[PDB]
Amino acid sequence: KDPRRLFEGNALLRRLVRIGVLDEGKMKLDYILGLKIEDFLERRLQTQVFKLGLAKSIHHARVLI
Amino acid sequence: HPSCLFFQYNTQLGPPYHILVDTNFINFSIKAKLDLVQSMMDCLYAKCIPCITDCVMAEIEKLGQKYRVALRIAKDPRFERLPCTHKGTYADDCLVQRV
Amino acid sequence: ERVFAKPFLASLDGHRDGVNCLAKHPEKLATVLSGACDGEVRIWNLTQRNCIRTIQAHEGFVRGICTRFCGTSFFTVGDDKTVKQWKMDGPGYGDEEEPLHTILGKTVYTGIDHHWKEAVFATCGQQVDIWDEQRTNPICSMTWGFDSISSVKFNPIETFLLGSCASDRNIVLYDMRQATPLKKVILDMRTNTICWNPMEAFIFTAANEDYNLYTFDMRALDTPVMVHMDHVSAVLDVDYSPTGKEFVSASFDKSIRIFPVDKSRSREVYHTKRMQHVICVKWTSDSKYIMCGSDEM
Amino acid sequence: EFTPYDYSQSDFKAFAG
Amino acid sequence: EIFNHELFGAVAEEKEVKQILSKVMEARRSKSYDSYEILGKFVGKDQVTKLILPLKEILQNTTSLKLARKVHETLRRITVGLIVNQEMTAESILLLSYGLISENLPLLTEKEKNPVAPAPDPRLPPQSCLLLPPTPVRGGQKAVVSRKTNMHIFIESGLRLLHLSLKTSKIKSSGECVLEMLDPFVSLLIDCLGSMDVKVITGALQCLIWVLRF
Amino acid sequence: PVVLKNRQAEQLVFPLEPIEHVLSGWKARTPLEQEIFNLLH
Amino acid sequence: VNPKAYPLADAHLTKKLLDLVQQSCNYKQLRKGANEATKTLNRGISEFIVMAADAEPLEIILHLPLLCEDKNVPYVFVRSKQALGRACGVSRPVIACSVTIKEGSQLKQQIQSIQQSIERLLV
Amino acid sequence: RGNQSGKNVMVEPHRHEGVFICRGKEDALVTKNLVPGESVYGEKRVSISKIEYRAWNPFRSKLAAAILGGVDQIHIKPGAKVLYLGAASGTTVSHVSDIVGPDGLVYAVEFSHRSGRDLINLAKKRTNIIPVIEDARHPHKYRMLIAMVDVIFADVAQPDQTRIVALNAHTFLRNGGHFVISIKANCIDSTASAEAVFASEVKKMQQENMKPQEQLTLEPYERDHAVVVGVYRPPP
Amino acid sequence: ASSQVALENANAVSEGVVHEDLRLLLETHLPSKVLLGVGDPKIGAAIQEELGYNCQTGGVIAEILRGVRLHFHNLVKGLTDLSACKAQLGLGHSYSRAKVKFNVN
Amino acid sequence: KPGHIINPIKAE
Ligand SMILES: [Mg+2]
Ligand SMILES: [Zn+2]
């Protein structure tokens, strides 16, 4: 119930949900502790272009971008 | 060869970490004034579950009343208490086998 | 006989603080109840050697536990000045376990014992109180002096009689029907626990602080019947075998002894390096096993 | 005739806001 | 808020300190008890539950005999005012007394409003392993108590409300439906004789003395 | 006397504690048995 | 309702199901038709099976639950083949569809959530 | 290519009893057909000169995957009584019935009424299979139908596998008997890693007075799957 | 007496209810302070309602029942015309047919 | 007897 914890944790969780690494149903600090580096690597434009079928390879996606 | 390993890298080792604690690790944590769970979380920034075997718990009991503080710390509800059916009490052999 | 003597059987683990209370189940041999200093009560299966249930009974120590003679309930006392009644059957599904009744009190009771036949229990705090299970108030109170009574025990034969030990090194005998104490005897040092002979109505044995054990005939309290002299520290607990020919004693020195009632020396002594300061001991009901509770949890 | 008051239908709403 | 802070808050401890009593004259007495007598006399009917509900909150969260006795004195002085309350009439006293003795009166504390979630179904998948276990507090965990703990105090208050109403001739045979309302009380007072609490039995016996004269 | 006797016993055993007999226990729940019982009583 | 169409989704679960079916079509991850749904079960590449409970002969799709119980694949029923037709991006009614396993897909979190929602229906 | 129909091939016994190897241009794992001339699920069979063997598919069976994966012991041998939990239609059950032979018995438990009808039809032709259409979570509901058994095989795929196996083991499994348990990591806990699930399931077995002895993964044919073999109440 | 009688008792035991045949055995050959060991807690309560016997499912009882199940064929040898092993195979089929509503045609 | 609970003596 510390006000600083509530304020800053809500801000951090909202930012993490906005960038897409967390889920709307996982809005707790424990799930932040669960995060990995592949979750952030999946949000790059290069991998997004490849996963949506615009490119046929990850390097092809990089070249297209 | 275990499928969890990508050459020397353990992929199935996950942010919930299960840590096998040796008997002398507990005593030196007491000497250094370090709380067990809190100091492990400071090192890893993740949830850590310390684990105590029957072999390790037996060696603390054999130490006596001089080591009663370490015995109370080992029996902590957050800790994971796991059984072992070995011949002998030697805890270095037991921990190597689980690894 | 010396080659084949292997007494140790098993050790039960699970308390997170030192064991303080032991209670056996009147109807079942393999069910026993224990209480630790942190306030939890655990039920054990002796055949499986595991813990069946765990309840957070009290805050502080649990100072006593007794079982109703039918076996469907048990009673406990803690440092929160409370008397609680629980159901022996475990809670169904994942429901949190809830006491049958809870009684608020003004003093910290030290022990509790139950009538063998008549659904009555007694508590010992600063004064001996006799309770009816259907009354939240004690129906009788007997007092002689200003003392801290450590233990109270019902007599299994002639069930209206009681025994007690207090802090000015005396032993007091009561009588439930006439609602008065009977007689008082004072020894050199304080007695810790008292136990009745289950085959001899007028015989009881006292565990004393002067390293010794005293067997008394309650008709003639001027002199003890026998003295038992093998311990080297204060004797904390005693319990009789159901045959009534032997008893087992726990002491602050890390051992337990078995004495014949007619002898002054112990028949056997048990010890272990991991065992320290045995607090409570109960002879099992089929006269085949002995269980002890110590402070290494 | 005598009919005792029926308390089983008491809503007790008069004692609450 | 002001009165309950005096009787059950941290201020109540300072009433025992002799150093404070010597310096401060106002610390030598607790006048919150007398104000409840004034509040009970001049309160509306709809505001009775608001007066009583904070008391039941305290009893459900206490295991101390000393605090339970202070709530008992609090409830007694409220009932003394309620008997001489003008809006309090013979019909309302009987209706309030029956709800208190039979425990049908809805108090609806916060715990009943939000019961704990049930234990997870073992057939279903367990919860995520990333969730941190609850931190353990220093000095041991909280012990469970019975749900009907200290609730005999509210039953005793209903008996006292009826007993003093009958003795001061607030309840009279003549007029409206007093005999209709007093009739179910006979069966209700009979069952109180089998109660486990001694003070509940004593209160019912005192009430039974007057209701057998009707 | 009981304690004195038990102290000198050479052996103590612990714990210390017919078709017509079975015929009495049964009751009637078949209509034939009901009629026979009613007529015979 | 025919008792043979037992795992019938409610209104809320149907909306989630049809949303994921449309998304799977855009990711080239949907096989449409009873015969094509059968082949994915034989090849072990099926995430779950969605069927229409309003097929006038219901028996024409009842072979699919038998195949799912052997491969341990969840399956549900919906009330409309016409609504299932639009969600599959087809101008004709569809009585059975299959969502396909694809490595590295972005739908893995939504597919996992739907699979658990199905299994709770079977208690 | 593969093992085309009309090719000469050699059949030799396996290290495990009741199991055979079909040696040719490709090697296949086969069992002796208890009912000659019939295929349960479309498998290829081989005729010997009165004797017939059926090919065993490791993609459609978990016991075949463990055998091809190099497991030490399976304990299913001719003349043995086997309790099977989660029989489904009976593709693996049919091969198990082949291994035990006419003297052995198989108890097939399957709760689903859809797959239960297939299990009864399979039990028509094979006299050593006893179909049991009941929930394995309550073994007391079918205690009349089952005697003491030697091996328990469980492929139930539930979050509470260990509790279900332990309850059946206490009721029907003899002292010195063995169990074979297939573990799908995603079914017990999807949040936890696959390797951490396997260590937890072994721990739960030890807490139920069961002693696991070996484990292996089924990697070429399954992902995040394991099989554990152990003994129940070992003799001294 | 017959396969139909066995199937009726098999359904009753599964549901946890006391069949008339079971109550006939219990009333005739039990004295009337009695401990009865049963495999199912639900059938134990039903017997305790129907007759005054005390029913228990825990303790030594579960370990004794494994001994009985192991040695059953020796105890009842020759008391029945139909063998124990064939009886289980026959009842297993008939029990499964009833659950799935199998049609022989 | 190995499994029988032994109760205290009662008048008889
Ligand atoms: Mg070492
Ligand atoms: Zn070990």
Which residues on neighbouring strands pair with residue E115, listed in sequence order?
none
Chains that touch B (3 or more CB pairs under 8 A): A, C, E, H
Of H193, H196, H207, Cβ closest to residue B83: H207
Of C26, C157, C286, Cβ closest to residue J9: C157
Gap between the Cα atoms of E141 and E158, Å rounded: 36
Orientation angle between helical segments E90-102 and E152-167, nearest 10 degrees: 150
Cα dihedral sign for H139, H142, H147, H152? negative
Determine contact, residues C184/C172, Cβ cutoff 8 Å. Answer: yes
List b or e across E28-57, with b for residues whose CB sees 16 or more CB atoms inside 10 angstroms.
Answer: eeeebbeebbebbbebebeebbebbeebbe
Orientation angle between helical segments H91-100 and H62-69, nearest 10 degrees: 60
Determine contact, residues H226/H216, Cβ cutoff 8 Å. Answer: yes
**Residue that has been written with the tokens 């139930």 in this structure:** H156
Token digits of residue H65? 């995957």
Q: How many CB atoms lie within 10 A of CB C44?
A: 19
Cα dihedral sign for I51, I57, I63, I69? positive
Contacts of C100 in chain E (CB under 8 A): 146
Gap between the Cα atoms of E15 and E26, Å rounded: 10
- Whether residues I27 and F26 touch (CB distance < 8 A) is answered with yes
Gap between the Cα atoms of C98 and B25, Å rounded: 40
Determine contact, residues H62/H225, Cβ cutoff 8 Å. Answer: yes
Determine contact, residues C236/C193, Cβ cutoff 8 Å. Answer: yes
Gap between the Cα atoms of C101 and H196, Å rounded: 44
Separation in Å, CA H190 to CA B14, C158, G17 = 13, 64, 21
Contacts of H118 in chain G (CB under 8 A): 66
Backbone angles phi, psi at H224, to 5 degrees: 55, 40
Gap between the Cα atoms of C41 and C30, Å rounded: 17
- Which chain E residue has its CA at the smallest distance from C40's CA? E143
Query: Nearest to residue C269, comparing CAs of C282, C257, C261?
Result: C257
Greatest CA span in chain H, whole angstroms? 54
CA angle E12/E16/E20 to nearest 5° reads: 100
Determine contact, residues H131/H106, Cβ cutoff 8 Å. Answer: no
Separation in Å, CA F29 to CA E91, F34, I24 = 56, 7, 11
Q: How many CB atoms lie within 10 A of CB E159?
A: 23
**Residue that has been written with the tokens 């009147």 in this structure:** C26
Token digits of residue E85? 């309350």
CA distance C292 to chain J (A): 20
Contacts of F2 in chain J (CB under 8 A): 9
Q: Residue H86: which residues within 8 A CB-CB, separation 6 or more? A: H109, H110, H136, H154, H155, H156, H157
Determine contact, residues A51/G106, Cβ cutoff 8 Å. Answer: yes
Token digits of residue C22? 């032991």
Q: How many CB atoms lie within 10 A of CB H29?
A: 21
Q: Residue A64: which residues within 8 A CB-CB, separation 6 or more? A: A49, A54, A55
Instruction: Indicate the CATH number for domain G1-123.
Output: 3.30.1330.30
Gap between the Cα atoms of C55 and C100, Å rounded: 13
Gap between the Cα atoms of H204 and H225, Å rounded: 17
Chains that touch J (3 or more CB pairs under 8 A): C, F
Say which DSSP state E189 is in: H
**Residue that has been written with the tokens 């296949």 in this structure:** H28
**Residue that has been written with the tokens 């109505």 in this structure:** C201
H156 is in an annotated binding site: yes
Determine contact, residues I79/C50, Cβ cutoff 8 Å. Answer: no
Separation in Å, CA G80 to CA G8, G93, H116 = 11, 9, 29
Q: Residue E178: which residues within 8 A CB-CB, separation 6 or more? A: E90, E94, E171, E172
Q: How many CB atoms lie within 10 A of CB I54?
A: 12
Cα dihedral sign for D16, E1, E2, E6? positive
Q: In what order do the strands lie in the sheet with C19-24?
A: C19-24, C31-36, C40-45, C50-56
Q: Residue A40: which residues within 8 A CB-CB, separation 6 or more? A: A21
Determine contact, residues G83/G53, Cβ cutoff 8 Å. Answer: no
* Stretch (H or E) spanning F3: helix F2-7
Determine contact, residues D17/E52, Cβ cutoff 8 Å. Answer: no
Q: How many CB atoms lie within 10 A of CB E161?
A: 26
Gap between the Cα atoms of G112 and G95, Å rounded: 23
Q: Residue C295: which residues within 8 A CB-CB, separation 6 or more? A: C18, C19, C276, C277, C279
Gap between the Cα atoms of C40 and C17, Å rounded: 9
Query: Nearest to residue C137, comparing CAs of C106, C169, C170?
Result: C106
Cα dihedral sign for C25, C30, C31, C37? positive
Gap between the Cα atoms of H154 and H136, Å rounded: 10
Separation in Å, CA H220 to CA G70, H216, I57 = 20, 12, 46
Determine contact, residues C8/C40, Cβ cutoff 8 Å. Answer: no
- Whether residues G116 and E123 touch (CB distance < 8 A) is answered with no
**Residue that has been written with the tokens 């003394």 in this structure:** E80
Gap between the Cα atoms of H211 and A41, Å rounded: 43
Determine contact, residues H56/H64, Cβ cutoff 8 Å. Answer: yes
Backbone angles phi, psi at C195, to 5 degrees: -145, 140
User: Do strands C226-228 and G96-100 pair parallel, antiparallel, or not at all (unpaired)?
Assistant: unpaired
Contacts of I27 in chain F (CB under 8 A): 25-26
Gap between the Cα atoms of G117 and C194, Å rounded: 63
Gap between the Cα atoms of C18 and C278, Å rounded: 10
Gap between the Cα atoms of C259 and G50, Å rounded: 77
Amino acid at D4: P
Query: Nearest to residue G34, comparing CAs of G69, G83, G84?
Result: G84
Token digits of residue I21? 């045949």
Determine contact, residues B91/B22, Cβ cutoff 8 Å. Answer: yes
Determine contact, residues C101/C149, Cβ cutoff 8 Å. Answer: no
- Which chain C residue has its CA at the smallest distance from F16's CA? C243
Determine contact, residues C226/C236, Cβ cutoff 8 Å. Answer: no
Gap between the Cα atoms of G95 and G84, Å rounded: 7
SS3 C19: strand
What is the CB-side half-sphere exposure of residue E146 using CA atoms within 13 A? 17
Gap between the Cα atoms of F35 and C32, Å rounded: 53
Chains that touch G (3 or more CB pairs under 8 A): A, E, H
Backbone angles phi, psi at C153, to 5 degrees: -140, 135
Q: Residue C185: which residues within 8 A CB-CB, separation 6 or more? A: C170, C171, C216, C221
- Which resolution, in Å, applies to this structure? 2.7
Q: Residue H114: which residues within 8 A CB-CB, separation 6 or more? A: G65, G66, G69
* Stretch (H or E) spanning H99: helix H91-100
ω into residue F15 within 30 of 0, thus cis? yes
Gap between the Cα atoms of C23 and C29, Å rounded: 11
Gap between the Cα atoms of E56 and E109, Å rounded: 8
Token digits of residue H142? 């079918």
Backbone angles phi, psi at C206, to 5 degrees: -115, 135
* Stretch (H or E) spanning H202: helix H194-206
Gap between the Cα atoms of E89 and C133, Å rounded: 40
List b or e across C69-95, with b for residues whose CB sees 16 or more CB atoms inside 10 angstroms.
Answer: beeebbbbbbbbbbbbbbebeeeeeee
Domain boundaries, chain G: 1-123
Kindly compute the dihedral angle of the four CA atoms of residues C23, C25, C31, C36, in this order, to the nearest 10 degrees: -20
What is the CB-side half-sphere exposure of residue H184 using CA atoms within 13 A? 15
Say which DSSP state E194 is in: G
N- to C-terminal Cα distance for chain F?
51
Backbone angles phi, psi at H192, to 5 degrees: -75, 155
Backbone angles phi, psi at C36, to 5 degrees: -105, 170
**Residue that has been written with the tokens 């001027």 in this structure:** C222
Gap between the Cα atoms of C241 and C197, Å rounded: 9
Q: How many CB atoms lie within 10 A of CB E182?
A: 20
Which residues on neighbouring strands pair with residue I36, listed in sequence order?
I55
Q: Residue H73: which residues within 8 A CB-CB, separation 6 or more? A: H178, H214, H229
Nearest listed ligand to the Cα of residue B57: 2
Query: Nearest to residue C151, comparing CAs of C215, C257, C239?
Result: C239
Separation in Å, CA H52 to CA H20, H30, H46 = 12, 10, 6
What is the CA E114 to chain-centroid distance, rounded?
21
Say which DSSP state J6 is in: P
Gap between the Cα atoms of C35 and C77, Å rounded: 10
Which residues on neighbouring strands pair with residue C42, listed in sequence order?
C34, C54
Establish if B46 touches chain A: CB-CB under 8 angstroms: yes
Backbone angles phi, psi at B28, to 5 degrees: -75, -20
Separation in Å, CA C198 to CA C124, C181, C224, C245, H84 = 22, 22, 18, 9, 54
Cα dihedral sign for E128, H138, C96, C121? negative
**Residue that has been written with the tokens 């019947």 in this structure:** C225
Gap between the Cα atoms of C233 and C255, Å rounded: 10
Burial of B72 (0-12, 13-18, 19+ CB in 10 A): middle
Token digits of residue C241? 């075998």
Determine contact, residues G51/G77, Cβ cutoff 8 Å. Answer: yes
- Whether residues B76 and C16 touch (CB distance < 8 A) is answered with yes
Q: Residue B77: which residues within 8 A CB-CB, separation 6 or more? A: C16, E133, E136
Say which DSSP state C164 is in: E
H31 is in an annotated binding site: no
Gap between the Cα atoms of I23 and I50, Å rounded: 8
SS3 C226: strand
Query: Strands, DSSP E only, in chain I?
Result: 35-37, 54-56
DSSP letters of E48-116? Answer: HHHHHHHHHHHHHT---HHHHHHHHHHHHHHHHHHHT-SS--HHHHHHHHHHHHHS-S----HHHHSPP
Amino acid at B88: G
Which residues on neighbouring strands pair with residue B16, listed in sequence order?
none
Gap between the Cα atoms of B39 and B28, Å rounded: 13
Gap between the Cα atoms of C233 and C235, Å rounded: 6
* Stretch (H or E) spanning B55: helix B54-63
Q: Residue H187: which residues within 8 A CB-CB, separation 6 or more? A: H157, H158, H159, H161
Contacts of A36 in chain B (CB under 8 A): 15
Gap between the Cα atoms of A58 and A43, Å rounded: 13
Separation in Å, CA C132 to CA C136, E20, E199, E209, I15 = 8, 44, 16, 27, 42
Q: Residue E108: which residues within 8 A CB-CB, separation 6 or more? A: E53
Token digits of residue E122? 């073992």
Gap between the Cα atoms of H181 and H179, Å rounded: 6
Burial of I31 (0-12, 13-18, 19+ CB in 10 A): exposed
Separation in Å, CA H133 to CA E43, H93, H98, H114, H202 = 69, 14, 21, 10, 29
Query: Nearest to residue H132, comparing CAs of H174, H93, H184?
Result: H93
Token digits of residue F10? 């050479």
What is the CA G22 to chain-centroid distance, rounded?
12
- Whether residues I27 and F22 touch (CB distance < 8 A) is answered with no
